[PDB]
From Swiss-Prot, chain A:
Signal peptide: none annotated. Pfam families: Ribosomal_L34. It comes from Deinococcus radiodurans (strain ATCC 13939 / DSM 20539 / JCM 16871 / CCUG 27074 / LMG 4051 / NBRC 15346 / NCIMB 9279 / VKM B-1422 / R1). The gene is rpmH. Part of the 50S ribosomal subunit. Contacts protein L4. This is Large ribosomal subunit protein bL34.
Swiss-Prot record, chain B:
One of its GO terms (biological process) is cytoplasmic translation. Part of the 50S ribosomal subunit. Forms a bridge to the 30S subunit in the 70S ribosome. This is Large ribosomal subunit protein uL2. One of the primary rRNA binding proteins. Required for association of the 30S and 50S subunits to form the 70S ribosome, for tRNA binding and peptide bond formation. It has been suggested to have peptidyltransferase activity; this is somewhat controversial. Makes several contacts with the 16S rRNA in the 70S ribosome. The keyword Chloroplast does not apply.
Length: 46, 272
RNA sequence: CUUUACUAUAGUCUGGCAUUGGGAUUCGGGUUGAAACUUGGAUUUCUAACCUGAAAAAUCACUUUCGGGGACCGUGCUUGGCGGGUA
RNA sequence: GACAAGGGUUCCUGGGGAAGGGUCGUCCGCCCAGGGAAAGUCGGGACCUAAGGUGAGGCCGAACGGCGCAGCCGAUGGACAGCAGGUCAAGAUUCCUGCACCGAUCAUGUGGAGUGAUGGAGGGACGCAUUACGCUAUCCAAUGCCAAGCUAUGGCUAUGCUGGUUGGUACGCUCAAGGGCGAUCGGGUCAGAAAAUCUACCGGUCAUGCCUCAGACGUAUCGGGAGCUUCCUCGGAAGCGAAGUUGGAAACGCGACGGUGCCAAGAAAAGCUUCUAAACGUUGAAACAUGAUUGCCCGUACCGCAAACCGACACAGGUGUCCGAGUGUCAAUGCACUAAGGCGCGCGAGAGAACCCUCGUUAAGGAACUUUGCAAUCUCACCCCGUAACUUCGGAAGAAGGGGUCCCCACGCUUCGCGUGGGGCGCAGUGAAUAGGCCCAGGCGACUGUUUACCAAAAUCACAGCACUCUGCCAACACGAACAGUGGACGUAUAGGGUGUGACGCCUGCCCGGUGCCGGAAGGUCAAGUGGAGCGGUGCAAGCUGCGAAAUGAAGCCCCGGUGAACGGCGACCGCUAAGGUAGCGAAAUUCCUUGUCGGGUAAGUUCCGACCUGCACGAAAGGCGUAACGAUCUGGGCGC
RNA sequence: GGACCGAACCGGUGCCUGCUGAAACAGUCUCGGAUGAGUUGUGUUUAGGAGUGAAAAGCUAACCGAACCUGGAGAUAGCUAG
């Protein structure tokens, strides 16, 4: 019963990446949106 | 004039027909002439499907061909081999140039291995001699014609197709395309004597489904199978013919689709 | 979701105006029976705009040497039609 | 059993007993602490490129941004130097022991001359199926060798039983299948931007010939080796060490880039080999071996078909590759039992009621059950004999149907056995396990295939074949802020797009009035726009201004012609509307009345088959009517059980 | 050889069991394909009136005739409750 989550690191990191979110404005938004309220530890740390 | 039909040893293979060979020299496409990077891929481009279907099929290698053949004018060449080229539907000739360079040209009908061929304007109208239209005899049958001086041969390179030379009017020579259309081409345009090979490609019986698949995939969906959302003809209770017949994004069958253009006054009798 | 329901619309066809120039012929006519400053139309033609292809320099750029197309096309503005493709 | 993912101390040692564990728990993959992971040679980087991602310049867009040549990035591929053993509680092609190789640097001798680029060329370099020969891994046999022992309950006293039976390296005139190589002079400038002593092309000149070892063998040597020994701190430590035979089988692995056949015609790039340009040296070069020196970065424990990864669980689910023994059975990764190895699935004990699940046997009967033989039997392997209508001559077909099968002896042969004869046993001999029930008719689709992840697998969709139609190449056509770009296509009407039909065979009629579509000089209407007669406002006027029509003005509809494998139409009592059904079929997947009427089959048949025809509402590419074969398709019937 | 029988594998025909499941789609038995239009690993590309689709309105992260999240936003609610 194959499930949705098939972990594959570096796919995980290829999308979703700090490096990745930096390349576009939309994620860069999300990045600095998360630096904000939500003192969050985010992205490639997890 | 061989075909190779089969027995009916399977459910298929009765109707199935393959092509004929042994006119083809066993040799490989050889060294970089090919330099083949077809990298076959469906209609995708910027990521979406443009020309529908065509989703698979056997790995190929493109063999570069010399279409214009201007530069080798006044230089002898002797036919070496005739090789099988996929994505062509014509045989191609190898030869060798006197200066020693090897190229490819498509193979006209009836070109034997070892024939002496000479490109250029002064050349005799022997098979495959690559000369300008001004120097082409009236009514003689040629192929691989340039649409414009320079560039390459955009006219009649598919198997069995030829263009006979109608009487020249101006520096433009009248010709007749294999669709039956008449045109006007510059007499500065090269062409190759004779008609294309591969016998009649047309009547090979193409086996069953999947022989299709040896080539571009194309399962070809029939939008009246589809739901209304997907396609106009779609929708119905049981089988229903049309109600309209525009397709697939509106349009229709018949209804000439060509824009009104500047090439149109170089054109003679667009009717068929 | 559908169509000959309403309405607009992507799209597309078409007239006018730019980009956009020259010369022959002809008819329409004005300003000083022809001369002739000419103003436009129609066909025709040329070539500097413009498009485009080959050449040791793959997309480009160039003196380019060139070859073809060429006042068309394409494109901006506007005119009217078509337009369940879409809303 | 070993890996790749993924997980992250789960590994090892010593503790612990709250919670986690489906009960317990002194125990654990849980808790605490401590330790463990070693690389020039393995995998990745300091090398290469594919798809794709980038992308100075360049091309485009209300912005943010979208493209795009070179180059760069990118292993799932190319390239590349080591094996054999030993061993911590816990690592090993990493550490140590023995022997080996690779690069870089320098010194010494040979050599004492050339070296060889960001550029050229060679080559790297590639498919599917089938297959000959040699071999190994590897397994099998024995009265082959070695080692240890003992005599069991009747017997055996070994000719019984048990285990073991060689790996690396070096050399060797030894054996050896298999495997790929022409060599050289000269010429032409128009080839590879010039170059070239290189490659290509053209011309001349001379079975065998060479090169190669897979693997076998012999000698040597370093390992390993059944066990033997003593110590033992509870059970492990150190030391010792025998022989390695003949006969057989054998790969998807090696000898290889082998041989042949086939059509759908099977990456790129660097390293690498050769060649010059530029440059340096033309006395200290290239090359060779000879020591020395040097060898970076990351990964490496443990789980890894699973209580350690994805499933909320110590979850009957799922997860890619490699290895995967023996005996029996044509063969096999099948089936049964077993080796090495791993395990008995983290509640337990009793009871032997109803009912419930999963099974075994069943009297006489044998489908009577029921919507339906649903389910479950019967059937089953291999050998021999034999086998229909129908057929597209392939098929149907494993059609149905019948016989054989075990053990001993003798004989013959191509001896893993088979054939023949004779004999023996049991109720029974593919003696247990894995292996079809079959047939007669129809309906639909020809066919293999595809489809509703989680109620539908089909008669749906695809399909080869056929037809209409568009498209002359900045093609039609599709994506798109965009005269950018790309796809169609590095394709050029034997091509590409769209549409419907759907092997094959015999075929495909009548009606264009309306709608669409192609072609249509008269004529009717028609937008902006040119033109601007005239009507009015204000001012005393020059004048400034508000509307404003004849003519002229494009595509389009109106009007004319054609076109049905174009939308369509061929009984709302014939009713008039362009015509009203050519074949073929018809109670049909179409039929209302209906269980139509006859006939067949049954004891009895609303079904099924055959007729008929009165077709409520068959019919020719929404194709008509047939059709061998095919079907986890649907319908009716028979035998067998 | 879109041939046959049949493992691996790919798939889901029929019955049953399961239905607070062992399991948010499975288990036994049975059956289909098993050199092709075959199966599948790795990297990559395409998405919300958008993609994909041998075509069910199927799939697009366990509920797709228009995914999810955040926002407009205390949408509106001639209706139901309180
Ligand atoms: Mg942190
Ligand atoms: Mg990190
Ligand atoms: Mg998290
Ligand atoms: Mg024949
Ligand atoms: Mg689409
Ligand atoms: Mg064809
Ligand atoms: Mg088709
Ligand atoms: Mg449908
Ligand atoms: Mg629609
Ligand atoms: Mg429809
Ligand atoms: Mg219908
Ligand atoms: Mg379209
Ligand atoms: Mg518009
Ligand atoms: Mg308008
Ligand atoms: Mg609407
Ligand atoms: Mg409308
Ligand atoms: Mg295992
Ligand atoms: Mg890991
Ligand atoms: Mg680790
Ligand atoms: Mg432990
Ligand atoms: Mg322990
Ligand atoms: Mg406890
Ligand atoms: Mg505690
Ligand atoms: Mg407990
Ligand atoms: Mg423990
Ligand atoms: Mg070492
Ligand atoms: Mg690179
Ligand atoms: Mg590239
Ligand atoms: Mg880009
Ligand atoms: Mg690119
Ligand atoms: Mg790799
Ligand atoms: Mg190596
Ligand atoms: Mg490496
Ligand atoms: Mg130990
Ligand atoms: Mg270990
Ligand atoms: Mg080791
Ligand atoms: Mg010297
Ligand atoms: Mg040299
Ligand atoms: Mg062999
Ligand atoms: Mg014995
Ligand atoms: Mg023995
Ligand atoms: Mg020996
Ligand atoms: Mg294998
Ligand atoms: Mg071979
Ligand atoms: Mg490179
Ligand atoms: Mg020099
Ligand atoms: Mg390990
Ligand atoms: Mg559990
Ligand atoms: Mg458990
Ligand atoms: Mg489990
Ligand atoms: Mg699996
Ligand atoms: Mg094996
Ligand atoms: Mg076995
Ligand atoms: Mg066996
Ligand atoms: Mg088994
Ligand atoms: Mg285990
Ligand atoms: Mg127990
Ligand atoms: Mg039972
Ligand atoms: Mg009985
Ligand atoms: Mg009976
Ligand atoms: Mg009854
Ligand atoms: Mg009954
Ligand atoms: Mg049954
Ligand atoms: Mg059975
Ligand atoms: Mg026969
Ligand atoms: Mg039958
Ligand atoms: Mg007896
Ligand atoms: Mg008997
Ligand atoms: Mg048996
Ligand atoms: Mg049994
Ligand atoms: Mg009949
Ligand atoms: Mg019937
Ligand atoms: Mg079917
Ligand atoms: Mg079959
Ligand atoms: Mg389903
Ligand atoms: Mg189903
Ligand atoms: Mg363009
Ligand atoms: Mg293009
Ligand atoms: Mg159909
Ligand atoms: Mg008429
Ligand atoms: Mg009846
Ligand atoms: Mg009835
Ligand atoms: Mg009767
Ligand atoms: Mg009956
Ligand atoms: Mg009757
Ligand atoms: Mg009944
Ligand atoms: Mg019934
Ligand atoms: Mg009947
Ligand atoms: Mg007809
Ligand atoms: Mg029809
Ligand atoms: Mg019909
Ligand atoms: Mg039909
Ligand atoms: Mg019929
Ligand atoms: Mg099937
Ligand atoms: Mg049924
Ligand atoms: Mg029946
Ligand atoms: Mg009887
Ligand atoms: Mg097959
Ligand atoms: Mg058969
Ligand atoms: Mg499926
Ligand atoms: Mg399964
Ligand atoms: Mg079967
Ligand atoms: Mg839409
Ligand atoms: Mg989820
Ligand atoms: Mg879903
Ligand atoms: Mg919704
Ligand atoms: Mg509210
Ligand atoms: Mg609001
Ligand atoms: Mg409202
Ligand atoms: Mg409100």
């Amino acid at each position: 019963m194959k499930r949705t989550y098939q972990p594959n690191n570096r796919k995980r990191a290829k999308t979703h990446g700090f490096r990745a979110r930096m390349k576009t404005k939309s994620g860069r938004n999300i990045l600095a949106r998360r630096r904000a309220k939500g003192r969050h530890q985010l992205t490639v740390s997890d | 004039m061989a075909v190779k039909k089969y027995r009916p040893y399977t459910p298929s293979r009765r109707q199935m027909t393959t092509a004929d060979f042994s006119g083809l020299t066993k040799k490989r496409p050889e060294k970089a002439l090919t330099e083949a990077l077809p990298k076959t891929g469906g209609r995708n481009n910027r990521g979406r499907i443009t020309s529908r279907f065509i989703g698979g099929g056997h790995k190929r290698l493109y063999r570069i061909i010399d279409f214009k053949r201007r530069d080798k004018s006044g230089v002898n060449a002797k036919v070496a081999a005739i090789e099988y080229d996929p994505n062509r539907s014509a045989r191609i000739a190898l030869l060798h140039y006197a200066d020693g360079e090897k190229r490819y040209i498509l193979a006209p009908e009836g070109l034997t291995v070892g024939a002496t061929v000479n490109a250029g304007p002064e050349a005799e109208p022997k098979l495959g001699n690559a000369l300008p239209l001004r120097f082409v005899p009236v009514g003689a049958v040629v192929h691989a014609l340039e649409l414009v001086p320079g560039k390459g041969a955009q006219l009649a390179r598919s198997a069995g197709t030829s263009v006979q030379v109608q009487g020249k009017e101006s520096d433009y020579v009248i010709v007749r395309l294999p669709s039956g259309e008449l045109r006007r081409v510059h007499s500065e345009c090269y062409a190759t004597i004779g008609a294309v090979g591969n016998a009649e490609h047309k009547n090979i019986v193409l086996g069953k489904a999947g022989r299709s698949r040896w080539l571009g995939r194309k399962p070809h969906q029939r939008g009246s199978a589809m739901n209304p959302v997907d396609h106009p003809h779609g929708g119905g209770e049981g089988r229903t013919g049309a109600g309209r017949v525009p397709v697939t994004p509106w349009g229709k069958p018949t209804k000439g689709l060509k824009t009104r253009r500047k090439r149109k006054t170089s054109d003679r009798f667009i009717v068929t």
